[PDB]
Design a protein around this ligand. Sequence first.
Ligand SMILES: NC(=O)c1ccc[n+]([C@@H]2O[C@H](COP(=O)([O-])OP(=O)(O)OC[C@H]3O[C@@H](n4cnc5c(N)ncnc54)[C@H](O)[C@@H]3O)[C@@H](O)[C@H]2O)c1
Ligand SMILES: NC(=O)c1ccc[n+]([C@@H]2O[C@H](COP(=O)([O-])OP(=O)(O)OC[C@H]3O[C@@H](n4cnc5c(N)ncnc54)[C@H](O)[C@@H]3O)[C@@H](O)[C@H]2O)c1
Ligand SMILES: O=c1ccn([C@@H]2O[C@H](COP(=O)(O)OP(=O)(O)O[C@H]3O[C@H](CO)[C@@H](O)[C@H](O)[C@H]3O)[C@@H](O)[C@H]2O)c(=O)[nH]1
Ligand SMILES: O=c1ccn([C@@H]2O[C@H](COP(=O)(O)OP(=O)(O)O[C@H]3O[C@H](CO)[C@@H](O)[C@H](O)[C@H]3O)[C@@H](O)[C@H]2O)c(=O)[nH]1
Lengths: 312, 312
Amino acid sequence: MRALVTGAAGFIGSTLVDRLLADGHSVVGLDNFATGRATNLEHLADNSAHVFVEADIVTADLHAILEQHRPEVVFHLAAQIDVRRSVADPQFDAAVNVIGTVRLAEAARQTGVRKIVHTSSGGSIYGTPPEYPTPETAPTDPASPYAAGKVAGEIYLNTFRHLYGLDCSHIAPANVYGPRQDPHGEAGVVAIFAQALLSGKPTRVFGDGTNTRDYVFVDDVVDAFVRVSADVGGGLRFNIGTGKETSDRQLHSAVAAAVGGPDDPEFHPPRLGDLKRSCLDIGLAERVLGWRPQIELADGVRRTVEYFRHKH
Amino acid sequence: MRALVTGAAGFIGSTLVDRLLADGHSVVGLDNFATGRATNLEHLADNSAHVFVEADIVTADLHAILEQHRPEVVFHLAAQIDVRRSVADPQFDAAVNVIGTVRLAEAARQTGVRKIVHTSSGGSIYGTPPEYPTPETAPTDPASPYAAGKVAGEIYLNTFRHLYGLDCSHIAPANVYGPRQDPHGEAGVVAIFAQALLSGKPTRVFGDGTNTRDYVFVDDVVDAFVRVSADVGGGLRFNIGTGKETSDRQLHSAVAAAVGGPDDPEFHPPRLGDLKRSCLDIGLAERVLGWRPQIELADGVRRTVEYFRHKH
Ligand SMILES: NC(=O)c1ccc[n+]([C@@H]2O[C@H](COP(=O)([O-])OP(=O)(O)OC[C@H]3O[C@@H](n4cnc5c(N)ncnc54)[C@H](O)[C@@H]3O)[C@@H](O)[C@H]2O)c1
Ligand SMILES: NC(=O)c1ccc[n+]([C@@H]2O[C@H](COP(=O)([O-])OP(=O)(O)OC[C@H]3O[C@@H](n4cnc5c(N)ncnc54)[C@H](O)[C@@H]3O)[C@@H](O)[C@H]2O)c1
Ligand SMILES: O=c1ccn([C@@H]2O[C@H](COP(=O)(O)OP(=O)(O)O[C@H]3O[C@H](CO)[C@@H](O)[C@H](O)[C@H]3O)[C@@H](O)[C@H]2O)c(=O)[nH]1
Ligand SMILES: O=c1ccn([C@@H]2O[C@H](COP(=O)(O)OP(=O)(O)O[C@H]3O[C@H](CO)[C@@H](O)[C@H](O)[C@H]3O)[C@@H](O)[C@H]2O)c(=O)[nH]1
């Protein structure tokens, strides 16, 4: 099939691009390099089944782009991804994450696109949820502008589905980690710990370091995108995670074990917008998509540390 | 108290301004005259308790404005209001209704505003709902971009409530009508019918004319706004309607009776984006706010026709 990936120059996006090409699809990648990296795509230079478009989803002529390339499925990964940034500038986060999504949907509905696969935020959209692990039936309750914009994106796509019959599904990942995640990003703790511990630079947790997340490996997340791209799970959100909680402190220890050396992070003040706990019920993805994560944290961390070590 | 009304030059906005002034408040009205009219406020020219600011919520320095005027309550009525327009240009609708709301919330949380009263759309946010009359407990299921943006607005304000403790409640009206509603557009059917029939100009219904809405008089909606402006019903949405369905055909008959004119509408094609039925369960507003609509359709329609007959 023909696929278009927004945020294609990014961590998850470039990984998804590689997977789709392997699966025999032709791919158009779209990115403005806000946080993505050309090196994530540089190996594709001579592949005729791949075309890259440098474009900003907020302002670009998405209608013209989609009219040219006629993607059957659009995988929408382009976003402002930093929670703290969204607090600093909710307007900008909303422009990229809400307006960008709306413009893409409006383009897609006019150009024969079959389905948009949205990227929500399983890790943040439920806010402080009524239970853990958190199922998709739990109400959204965002507590950061980033989380709100992701919810708004889902709703707008659901709307276009009613309005025009433009199919959509929402991939809602937990905390994604692995190769190609920006070591110099403001977010992505696994990458941050790995890079710093390899370099012997200081590491820090926030609060008492008890804050928990659900750490899911990139290759597993990519598989979920592929599964949901077919005519299945239409109209629905799927939590994509492991259903296992790992504290800031516990993760540090695991990364230290993989790198070697000391396991002694600093403790810094909590950050406004960040939730205390995150753990996803992944039953729906199993039942409906046949999706299950293959990579356990210890293995994923080893893989990620090794990757960083080699590239370092 | 100090109050600021966005959309103050509009139909509901100007009516609310009048009420707030009568209740002894100082009022700042804010509008860009996208759909509002200076004539709706011209009677206030010599009232020292009223100040008007011309500003576009999408781009104006709202922080500066709130820092100057220091409202305790912001009544947020500024919006793109036309469902079909939202279908024709979802980006523009999203810019005004989502981005505008986000910017206002970001301004308000910085200037010591106690509460924002949002205006949602009870009539559209539920889409095709599970039951009629529809309670607030029914899931939102928007089927127009306008409805989606109203839902997104709610969610962002709920987010700012978590983030900063900026209080919010969502007034979610059904179909509001009465004096000052503009008769010259495609929205505001009661006004359209009333002025056209008085003028002997053609009228029309859409589809088979059986579509229903819940018609609630402007003064009733204004009272709900005032009631919810106190520290009451924090974090909640309130359906503001009558809980009675009137079809397009029945409405036309009602307006024709009030005017004393012919009841012979043309029949035009359906409008994409328009729901078939809309009816609100108003129990929650009664319980929490002590609010009930006083004005029955027959009486409200009479008062609406009179507005056009007495108009300067
Ligand atoms: N990494 C995680 O833990 C995680 C978990 C849940 C959700 N997500 C979502 O997954 C998606 C991919 O995130 P990631 O982890 O790969 O981060 P990333 O920053 O590597 O990927 C985001 C990509 O979007 C691009 N982009 C940003 N704004 C753009 C714009 N206006 N126009 C065009 N392109 C733009 C960036 O340049 C980047 O390449 C995002 O939607 C993110 O919100 C990530
Ligand atoms: N009329 C109804 O049936 C009804 C019911 C439910 C919801 N609402 C909501 O009630 C509010 C008022 O609607 P109305 O019926 O009075 O219509 P209206 O068009 O008279 O009022 C909207 C006002 O907002 C102003 N405005 C629009 N965009 C603006 C911007 N970018 N910056 C500043 N001002 C801007 C317009 O100029 C106008 O004065 C809106 O939020 C609308 O969505 C209306
Ligand atoms: O130096 C650091 C950085 C982070 N953390 C902790 O690591 C966790 C994860 O933080 P971060 O890597 O910044 O990710 P999140 O803010 O949780 O959000 C990520 O995971 C979400 C999952 O839904 C995505 O939506 C977001 O885009 C993505 O940035 C938190 O508990 C932080 O306190 C540390 O202890 N030390
Ligand atoms: O010439 C006309 C115009 C409208 N209608 C009918 O009247 C009804 C009401 O339509 P309209 O006045 O355009 O309002 P809505 O599209 O229902 O939306 C209104 O009511 C919502 C209630 O929440 C608000 O959110 C919106 O801002 C407001 O425009 C519909 O069934 C139309 O078919 C006619 O029969 N003839």
